[PDB]
């Protein structure tokens, strides 16, 4: 059903749509804090061994 | 804004005058649309002062 039935907004532009949609989720810090977390994860196993 | 733009010509090194963020188009602008053409017009006439 999802393959056979799909439509667009009636007059859309596919750069305005994305410059509006992708914008608010690029003020997060979890994508950096996981990089902080992987340091502790990698150093703890070296301290253990 | 017009008289402050004229007064800013004297104090070039201390203060600089720019057009606001909100006077630009939404995101990009899409020449397809009509309102952003007039936005471009207003901006391109305001900028040389």
């Amino acid at each position: 059903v999802a393959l056979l039935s799909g439509k667009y907004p009636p007059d859309l532009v596919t750069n305005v749509w994305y410059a509006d949609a992708i914008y608010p989720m690029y003020a997060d810090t979890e994508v950096f804090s996981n990089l902080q977390r992987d340091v502790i994860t990698c150093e703890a196993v070296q301290t253990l061994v | 804004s017009f008289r402050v733009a004229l007064a800013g010509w004297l104090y070039n090194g201390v203060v600089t005058t720019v057009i606001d963020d909100s006077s630009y188009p939404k995101d990009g602008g899409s020449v397809t649309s009509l309102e952003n053409l007039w936005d471009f017009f207003i901006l391109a006439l305001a900028l040389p002062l």
């Binding site: 907004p9 007059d11 859309l12 532009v13 305005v16 749509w17 509006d20 949609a21 | 939404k26 899409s30 397809t32 649309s33 009509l34 309102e35 952003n36």
Partner: peptide, 25 residues
Amino acid sequence: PMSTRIAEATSAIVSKVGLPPTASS
């Protein structure tokens, strides 16, 4: 007057831009 009372009913019946749509709107 009735001239205003009918106009308010016409405005109550007949009620509610050219831009590319965004995900907010």
